[PDB]
């Protein structure tokens, strides 16, 4: 099994011509990681092992500066674009002015066994919990998503938390989410978060 | 580290002569997923990124025609004969006049994350959610186990779902699961996904 | 994409000298999975595709004998050690009288896409079930997470499980979780799992 692990997306339907992943020189991504396709990672992001990013279905998928897609992570999303050249603006997410099918942004931790699936927008300096789940949402800045808790169809508003276990699927329950505050258990993690895996980037990279 | 990702199965006290996969030669098999032992793929079947098919324990392991086996989806079962050369049918699963450890239909779906541990049946044109678990039970056809679901020694009636984060171990509860219908927002989803999937395997072994 | 499976893990704050991962001759470590870092695996282990054990935040992650790290599963630890030298002892596991970031026992099966994350001690002949997570736990001897259930904050009191299903968060729930008895279904399973798969180690060494 000979292979190249960062690869062009394939032909196909919605896909006219290939591309293939726009990777900042600081960014680390494992050997057995996979990022193919439409994809733009940012500065000091490390990518662990078995993670993977596909962006050849819904596409575009941005990582911003020093977030971190640990290991086993996928992130995915529905087809943004039919057979026609019509752009399926409901699979589309809109974050500033610019259209991506997944946006994950800066300071922003995916954990172990995570997933974002597009449609979907993760906001700055938010922790997304080991094993969470993320689909057809808008997750705010400065939230916590704790472990195994699941946004789905939702917009999380912006500095609230979802506990451990908890699916919100309906727009009514995202907004009574509780708040983030300082004695919250996950108050500080994600800066710590970040700050270990930028570190852990730069070291890896300099085994690479 | 060199190795072929597609393989035998090791010589144990339960399989006395290794068996390598059959996979049709119109089904992707990506470079970093695993496929092992008494595996049979169908036409146009993908398999992505950190896939692990695994048919050393319990055999065989069948995937169907235009089925897909997304991004770190496990399939693996218990163990069905023993050290003694006796079939232990508990672990055994029976669609149409066949024996299977696991048995994935046709125009099946498994989405990113999920698992289906055998002894175990899907039926055709089911959609697994992601991070969806299936583990002693037959899934009838056309269903849909939305995100987070899980079936656990039941058996899910034809054209019935089973909502995200459900964890259903009782048959009362299978027997009341609702059906999926027209206006059911996973109603068409099946469909596209196998439409979309079947369009990536074709691209994806045009750059193989 | 050439690369070693099994990787010293990177110099970084606090993290002086690299180590590499100290693997008893009769482990096998398949060449899918990944394993980094200050990690000991005892004999007869079976590491199997897509796992990833990594040893570069917290450390020691330490994997004793005839136990499992099914496909799929993450071992990974907070820091132990912080940029000044000092040991954060509340993400450290004391077992016997030695400190790990996270402590795997003997005969221990970690099942497909489950998460044991440190500070973590999982006792001798535990099983922890598909999909299931274990985070800031010590997980008891002789005890059964079944499939989707999660142990956080909270230690498991030896010879009980955890309903499939189940978050676990608070020390009240988990002083009163239900006792494995000689008629509760998973109560001789990991004596069969860890027989299978000290067998499938052997077996699939002999084709290494
Ligand atoms: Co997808
Ligand atoms: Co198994
Ligand atoms: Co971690």
């Given at each position: ?79 943004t674009?039919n057979?026609?050249?019509?752009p399926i603006?409901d699979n ?117």
């Amino acid at each position: 099994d000979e292979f190249s692990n960062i690869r062009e997306n394939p032909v196909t339907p919605w896909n006219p011509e290939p591309s293939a992943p726009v990777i900042d020189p600081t960014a680390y991504i494992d050997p057995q990681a996979s990022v193919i396709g439409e994809v733009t990672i940012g500065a000091n992001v490390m990518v662990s092992p078995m993670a993977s990013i596909r962006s050849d279905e819904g596409m575009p998928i941005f990582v911003g500066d020093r977030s971190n897609v640990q290991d086993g992570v996928v992130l995915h999303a529905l087809e943004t674009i039919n057979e026609e050249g019509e752009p399926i603006e409901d699979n589309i997410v809109e974050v500033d002015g610019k259209e991506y099918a997944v946006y994950i942004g800066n300071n922003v931790s995916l954990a172990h066994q995570s997933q974002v699936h597009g449609p979907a927008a993760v906001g700055d300096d938010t922790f997304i919990g080991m094993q969470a789940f993320v689909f057809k949402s808008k997750v705010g800045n400065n939230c916590v998503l704790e472990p195994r808790s699941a946004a789905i169809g939702v917009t999380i508003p912006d500095g609230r938390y979802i506990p451990a276990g908890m699916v919100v699927t309906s727009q009514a329950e995202a907004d009574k989410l509780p708040e983030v505050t300082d004695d919250y258990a996950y108050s500080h993690t994600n800066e710590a978060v970040v700050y270990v895996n930028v570190h852990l980037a730069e070291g890896y990279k300099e085994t690479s």
